[PDB]
Amino acid sequence: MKLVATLSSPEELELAEKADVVELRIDLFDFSGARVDKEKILTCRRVSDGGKFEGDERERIEKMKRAFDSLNPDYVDLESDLPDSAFDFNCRIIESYHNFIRTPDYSELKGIVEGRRGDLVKIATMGKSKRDVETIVRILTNYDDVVAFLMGERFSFTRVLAAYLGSPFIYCYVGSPKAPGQISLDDAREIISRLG
Amino acid sequence: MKLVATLSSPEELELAEKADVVELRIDLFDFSGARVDKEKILTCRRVSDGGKFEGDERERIEKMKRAFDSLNPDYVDLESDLPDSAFDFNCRIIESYHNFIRTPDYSELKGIVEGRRGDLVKIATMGKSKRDVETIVRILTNYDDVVAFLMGERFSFTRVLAAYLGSPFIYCYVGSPKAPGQISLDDAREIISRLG
Predict the structure, then answer these.
(1) The CATH number of B1-196 is which of 3.40.630.10, 2.60.120.280, 3.40.1440.60, 3.20.20.70?
(2) Do B134 and A131 touch (CB under 8 A)?
(3) Where does 3-dehydroquinate bind (chains A, B)?
């Protein structure tokens, strides 16, 4: 039941002391270059999932494999649209699904959780209505080992509700918010100490 | 969202400075003719609903009507099981349903909302599983001006988190927690500040 701080730069390694886990976005900066003692997630986000990696699957996995060797991460984040052959990293896996256009229906997200290759499933989808909160609460009500929350300014609170429905993680920002609705490490810690 | 502090003694009146609204519980303290300048709810809670008013509805309503006259409250809390004619108070009415044993299925709770007499409906039911969180979230998703949360220690988070689905109110304790799972005025304001 942990705070995950997403890091985008070397500046940000110092800002993450309150975090349990740290997410190393190697599409944003090469963390391969220095040692991170904290529990860590290796991610290389494709452009099509709001990241900065713009290149084919081949160069992306090669870059992730070389970073995996030198960081020895606790998790790798791999995407739900990849085939089973790609889930070949020797650690726990976060299998993620991103949607910046919409929250799919319950039926559609249930297929992702149920077809899981990863140790944890992560779902992060654009909130456009309160029915989408419903979709995500159902999913967490019905499955375990799932991080599911809604993105967008209006849906910030779902980041925290999810932990209370069994999500192992709350993802937080360090420095500045990288997108609308993101919650600071300080804020998240305050909120959860208050709620219990 | 407004924060409501439930007052049970004259000491607690001095403690509600950061509440938007105070709920005067006259089954526990004769608030009758108390100078309260803040938005207020008059409530006289039956033992069967977890308070300490015993004997007649005749006695209880007489008690409430006299308390109305002196206090001039903004709302009155009237229970959902009362016939239409009880709703003869000249102010806004919060119609409420308490279940200390159970959170009913969605269809039963929907009936209470659509069969409403009051301006607001309040649903406070004993949380027994995560499925109960989803019931209460469907209700808030499908209806406006409803306060719905789960009672009990394991489901505190719903008292704050569930109000982000359009509830007018968060109910807060002041001084000591009156029931297990209750959220303090302080913690409620801080989470609300930090969430956005």
Answers:
(1) 3.20.20.70
(2) no
(3) 23-25, 45, 159, 182
